[PDB]
Design a protein around this nucleic acid. Structure first.
Lengths: 73, 49, 73, 49, 124, 48, 186
DNA sequence: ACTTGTCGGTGGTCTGCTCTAACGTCACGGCCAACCGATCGGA
DNA sequence: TCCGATCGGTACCGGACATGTAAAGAGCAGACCACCGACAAGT
């Protein structure tokens, strides 16, 4: 069948971002990131992992200064 | 050297309960597919199809 | 005017495309029956569905008064 | 009003909050997720931080 | 600064550009044109400098910035600037030795000296 | 409406719906340092 | 028209006699004020009575960017100008001068207020002329005309046509849907 | 003697404003078509 | 009390993209630019 891993594997550390909201793009063809939706947020809240959720929301998506500071650190 | 003792979070959508996100210790493999433990499928509701 | 090839496809801007047949409801008169849950009586109706035209509906209500709704009035 | 607006019926909630001049206190899971603060549960409570 | 410095800087800038540089950019970029009192003194000075350069022989072309640009700028064609290749060396020695012997007209001697200097700058 | 008989998007349309500002861009985001791939079975691995 | 002119002249004379003039008699001031008010009422009546030709003229410009009511309002401005410039001595009916001014106002406004990136009228006219010539060439040749034919039939360089065609692009919307469902945007 | 700044002029293109006199006078191109529960304004 | 009508809602990931017309035309003026004169005062 036409479902090969060569067309499925994707990974990213830092790439292009959006314009209005400074969030990473989506899709393999654009070197985008993986969406951490509301259900994953519920799972993190149920686990009790406050810091993982906070860093995922702030310094991996939107914190413009935080992204470059984290990379430098 | 860098991935040793550095956990990674694995998630499968939809995330119905807490056990849809789980932390694992990674090991490098030569393929392009993630190797998942057979005993964590029921938590993820995952099958290899 | 674009022309279909011998294999049933249209070459548009260099790409082969297929026009898919559409299942629609033929115009005509359609009679329907319903049962009211507030009085337990049967109510009938008829709808005239044209192509590119106004809608004409007749119905029978609880008060046994035949009513026509020209257009959607 | 922030959680209510994020949940459902944004326009009605915003209109009612604006007319009532409500003031959100910012203590809850949804509001802290939205504004970027640590949620008041798990490791984010004052005892553990 | 100095007029000679302005001329040399203008020549170099118009030689090294890739697109038609407008006069407004020439004022800010080229040194020596930024000390003018008003926009009319600069305009007249730049016109006189262009006249001098064109009369000298340096190819100074005026044309559009680009297709989709209505601004008008200036350049210098590096290919039309000169001709690199030169001939033999024995004949040029005889030509130089007979370049000027007794002529007194200032235009003639200046022209011969300029030709000899250009030949020296293009080999012997 | 604009070209193609598509109604224009106002501020309320920005703030409302599943595709609105809140649900799509505040309660869930796209993140860096993330990947995605097909899963196979490794029976020789440990539970961790 | 005669009432409008009389009212305007009476207003001007009253203004002139107000400053550096003389004490007008009470009846004269009353008559001047009455004539001015009658002229204003006559102007309003003519405008209101002719606010039906504007709709007919603007009916033909529907679907070209601007909305119907905006076209009607611009036509109303043109009608105001036509009322201001109408002369009754020539004997022609109002429906010709009014038509000219209404059409001019509607066309000029649609040239200005119809593009997100504004193009001057002197270039909108050139674009329209190029389009008309292109249509005529398409009808004549039978094929799509190349820039060469447009250059010959528009007495312009074969390069300005490319710039004109490139100035006619309209920006697309960032909010248009990409997929079949309603989750993707440009 | 050469330069230089103020003065004045010719010619060209891009941009905006005004005007044109037979008579003309009250918009369309088009669905909507689920299906549930809640609720305010009528009857 | 019954009554139509508006208004709210309907799981997740992956991917996938950019429109199709114009009834024109002229005369007049300000602005900026590319080419030039003088001209005395300054170099």
């Amino acid at each position: 069948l036409h479902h090969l891993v060569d067309d499925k594997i994707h990974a990213r550390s830092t790439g292009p971002y959006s314009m209005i909201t400074q969030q990473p793009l989506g899709g393999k063809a654009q070197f985008g990131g993986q969406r951490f939706g509301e259900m994953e947020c519920w799972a993190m809240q149920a686990y009790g992992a406050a810091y993982t959720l906070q860093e995922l929301l702030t310094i991996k998506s939107d914190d413009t200064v935080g992204r470059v500071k984290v990379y430098e650190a | 050297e860098v991935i040793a003792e550095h956990p990674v979070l694995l998630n499968r959508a939809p995330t119905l309960h807490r056990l849809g996100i789980q932390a694992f210790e990674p090991q490098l493999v030569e393929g392009k597919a993630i190797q998942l433990h057979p005993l964590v499928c029921e938590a993820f509701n995952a099958d290899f199809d | 005017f674009p022309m279909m090839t011998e294999k049933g496809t249209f070459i548009i801007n260099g790409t082969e495309r297929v026009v898919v047949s559409q299942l629609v409801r033929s115009p005509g008169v359609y009679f329907d029956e319903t049962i009211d849950k507030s009085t337990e009586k049967t109510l009938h109706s008829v709808k005239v569905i044209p192509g590119r035209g106004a809608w004409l509906e007749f119905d029978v209500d609880k008060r046994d008064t035949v009513g026509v709704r020209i257009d959607r009035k | 009003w922030l959680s209510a607006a994020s949940f459902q019926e944004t326009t009605r909630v915003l209109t009612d909050a604006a007319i009532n001049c409500r003031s959100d206190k910012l203590n809850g899971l949804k509001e802290n997720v939205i504004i970027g603060k640590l949620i008041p549960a798990g490791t984010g409570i004052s005892r553990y931080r | 600064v100095s007029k000679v410095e302005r001329l040399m800087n203008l020549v170099i800038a118009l030689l090294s550009t890739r697109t038609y540089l407008p006069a407004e950019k020439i004022r800010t970029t080229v040194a020596g044109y930024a000390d003018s009192p008003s926009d009319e003194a600069f305009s007249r000075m730049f016109e006189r400098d262009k006249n001098e350069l064109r009369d000298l022989g340096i190819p100074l072309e005026t044309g559009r910035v680009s297709k989709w640009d209505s601004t008008e700028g200036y350049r210098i064609n590096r290919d039309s600037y000169a001709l690199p290749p030169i001939g033999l060396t024995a004949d040029e020695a005889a030509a130089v030795a007979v370049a000027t012997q007794l002529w007194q007209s200032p235009e003639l001697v200046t022209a011969t000296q300029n030709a000899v200097l250009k030949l020296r700058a293009a080999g012997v | 409406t604009g070209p193609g008989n598509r109604p224009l998007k106002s501020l309320s349309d920005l703030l409302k719906g599943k595709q609105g500002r809140f649900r799509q861009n505040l309660l869930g985001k796209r993140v860096d340092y993330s990947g995605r791939s097909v899963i196979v079975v490794g029976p020789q691995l440990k539970l961790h | 028209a005669k009432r409008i002119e009389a009212g305007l002249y009476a207003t001007q004379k009253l203004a002139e006699l107000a400053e550096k003039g003389e004490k007008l008699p009470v009846q004269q001031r009353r008559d001047m004020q009455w004539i001015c008010r009658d002229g204003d009422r006559a102007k309003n009546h003519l405008l209101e009575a002719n606010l039906r030709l504007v709709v007919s003229l603007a009916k033909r410009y529907t679907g070209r960017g601007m909305a119907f009511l905006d076209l009607i309002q611009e036509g109303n401005l043109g009608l105001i100008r036509a009322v201001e410039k109408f002369d009754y001595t020539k004997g022609y009916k109002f429906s010709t001068y009014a038509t000219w001014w209404i059409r001019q106002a509607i066309t000029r406004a649609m040239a200005d207020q119809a593009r997100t990136i504004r193009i001057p009228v002197h270039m909108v006219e050139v674009i329209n002329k190029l389009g008309r010539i292109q249509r005529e060439l398409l009808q004549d040749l039978g094929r799509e005309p190349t820039p060469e034919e447009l250059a010959k039939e528009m007495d312009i360089t074969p390069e300005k046509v490319l710039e004109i065609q490139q100035y006619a692009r309209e920006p697309i919307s960032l909010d248009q849907t990409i997929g079949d469902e309603g989750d993707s945007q440009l």
